[PDB]
């Protein structure tokens, strides 16, 4: 019935391929210099008026953290050294003066066309134990969740993002506010089976007929002002290997 919210442009269903290159793949910058990060689309952003370029910043262990949404917008809460600029197809994240806690993995990222993510941009300035989380045999299936709170969930498009060792981000479902739409990638399509709950404000991603290379962190998120992904659940980690 009444008009839902959606987690990209393209996935509107009621009536009212992006390839992203970003360069350098890594920065090395000093305290207090200007750090610049690029990124190139294969098609314009440009959509009524708006611009649909997000920027995230990751740091190890952690999910990613909104910094600018609609090309140029500051996230709430993010200091006025980050900034970003651009139109179409050209696009730029400034930081500058650099922090010590701004050393981490850039990513930018188009909702006009599903979602998709440049390859990163790790900043660094001037003993390890790493979770795999659950593991499965291929062809076999897992069920993750979360839950919201804070928040009407139910106004809210969410998703499922991925990230793989490479620490490549891919989209893997979304799922309009009220739950009638959901959307895939062909990578999952058939075998990936996205649901909430409204009532008691979950999300769901059920897997199936998993795959090798289905191995990821993955990430339930909201989808906030002008498409960005604007929080994200902290990670669950999938092993898929024989």
């Known amino acids: 019935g009444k008009i839902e919210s959606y987690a990209a442009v393209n996935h509107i269903s009621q009536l009212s391929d992006i390839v992203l290159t970003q360069s350098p793949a890594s920065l090395a910058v000093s305290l207090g210099q200007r750090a610049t990060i690029s990124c190139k689309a294969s098609?314009?952003?440009?959509?009524?008026?708006?611009?649909?370029m997000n920027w995230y910043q990751q740091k190890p262990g952690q999910p990613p953290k909104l910094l600018i949404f609609?090309?140029?917008n500051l996230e709430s809460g993010i200091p006025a050294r980050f900034s970003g600029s651009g139109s179409g197809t050209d696009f730029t994240l400034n930081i500058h003066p650099v922090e010590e806690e701004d050393a981490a993995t850039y990513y930018c990222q188009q909702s006009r066309e599903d979602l998709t993510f440049g390859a990163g941009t790790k900043l660094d300035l001037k003993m390890l134990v790493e979770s795999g989380g659950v593991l499965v045999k291929p062809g076999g299936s897992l069920k993750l969740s979360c839950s919201a709170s804070?928040?009407?969930?139910?106004?809210?498009?969410m998703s499922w993002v991925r990230q793989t060792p490479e620490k490549r981000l891919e989209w893997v479902a979304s799922?309009?506010?009220?739950?009638?739409?959901?959307f895939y990638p062909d990578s999952v399509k058939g075998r990936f089976t996205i649901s909430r709950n409204n009532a008691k404000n979950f999300l769901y991603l059920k897997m199936s007929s998993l795959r090798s290379e289905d191995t990821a962190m993955y990430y339930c998120?909201?989808?906030?002002?002008?498409?960005?992904?604007?929080?994200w659940g902290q990670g669950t980690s999938v092993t898929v290997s024989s």
């Open positions: 799922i309009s506010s009220g739950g009638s739409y959901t």
């Open positions: 998120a909201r989808s906030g002002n002008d498409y960005a992904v604007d929080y």
């Open positions: 804070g928040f009407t969930f139910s106004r809210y498009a």
């Open positions: 098609q314009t952003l440009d959509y009524d008026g708006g611009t649909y």
């Open positions: 609609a090309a140029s």
